[PDB]
C-alpha cells in the first residue's frame, strides 16, 4: 500500500531517467539507489529483478498492485507495446503528482 | 518561469545529477524534456554558460528572475563541497514545498 507522494516521486524520477535514454535496468537502479525509504528501494529493485529476469515493465510492476494500480500498469504496457515508454511515464508522472496534491490539500 | 516549472526542473536535474550524468548532459536532458520552450531555453542558456567554463551557480546566477539568490548560494556551496547532488535534492524538496503552497491557494 504506497503513499501517493512516494509513487509520485518514483514515477517522476523514473520518467526523467528513461527520457534521458538510460536503459531501463539502469534507470530502475538509479531510482532504487536514490530512494530515502528502504521500502521504496526494495520495491524498485524487485521490479528491476523481474525486468532483468525477462518480464516487461508492466508485468514486473504488475507483481505489486498495492503500489502500481491496474490503470498505471496498462498505461506502461501500452507505451512498451508502442515503443513510447518515455511518453507514457511522463504522462504518469503528471497523473501521480495530481494524486499527491489531492492528498496534501486535505491532510 | 513559474514556481511549478522551477520545481519540475530542479527535481529532474537532481535526479540526473544523482544518477551521475555529467552536468552538461543533465542540463541538455532537462532542456529536451521540457514542454515549454521558455523552460528549455533557460536550461539551454544555463548549459551554455556551463560549457563556457562557469559554475552552475554562476550560470544560474545570470537568471535572477528564475534562480533566487538562496538557490544559487546552495548550488555554489554544493559545488564547493563536491555534493551538488545532495544540494539539488534539498532544493528539489524546497521548490516542491513552495509549489504545493501556491497550489493550495490556486484553487
Amino acid at each position: 500500500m504506497i503513499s501517493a507522494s512516494d509513487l509520485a516521486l518514483l514515477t517522476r524520477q523514473l520518467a526523467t531517467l528513461v527520457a534521458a535514454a538510460l536503459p531501463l535496468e539502469e534507470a530502475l537502479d538509479a531510482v532504487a539507489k536514490q530512494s530515502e525509504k528502504p521500502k521504496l528501494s526494495a520495491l524498485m529493485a524487485a521490479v528491476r529483478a523481474k525486468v532483468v529476469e525477462g518480464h516487461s515493465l508492466a508485468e514486473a510492476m504488475g507483481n505489486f498492485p498495492g503500489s502500481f494500480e491496474r490503470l498505471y500498469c496498462a498505461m506502461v504496457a501500452a507505451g512498451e507495446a508502442s515503443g513510447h515508454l518515455d511518453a507514457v511515464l511522463n504522462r504518469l508522472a503528471d497523473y501521480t503528482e495530481q494524486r499527491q496534491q489531492m492528498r496534501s490539500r486535505i491532510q
Side-chain angles (χ1 to χ4, degrees), chain A:
Chain A
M1 261 329 304
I2 208 182
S3 91
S5 57
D6 284 342
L7 186 56
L9 179 63
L10 296 173
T11 305
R12 176 52 65 196
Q13 294 168 319
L14 188 61
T16 307
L17 296 165
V18 173
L22 266 64
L24 190 52
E25 300 75 18
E26 302 186 17
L28 297 161
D29 241 18
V31 174
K33 287 195 211 182
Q34 282 177 41
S35 188
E36 285 176 16
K37 297 197 192 179
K39 47 166 178 181
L40 301 169
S41 289
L43 171 67
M44 291 317 283
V47 174
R48 184 182 182 282
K50 294 289 149 59
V51 169
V52 153
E53 266 179 60
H55 305 297
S56 73
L57 183 56
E59 296 177 77
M61 279 166 166
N63 278 104
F64 311 85
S67 284
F68 301 109
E69 74 189 291
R70 168 190 74 187
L71 174 59
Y72 182 120
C73 307
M75 294 274 284
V76 174
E80 289 182 289
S82 58
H84 287 88
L85 175 64
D86 57 334
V88 165
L89 293 169
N90 299 349
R91 183 90 80 220
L92 282 177
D94 285 343
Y95 163 72
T96 48
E97 285 175 350
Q98 290 179 16
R99 297 171 75 258
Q100 146 194 254
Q101 253 170 231
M102 284 168 32
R103 165 75 69 185
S104 68
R105 180 55 189 272
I106 82 184
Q107 90 187 353

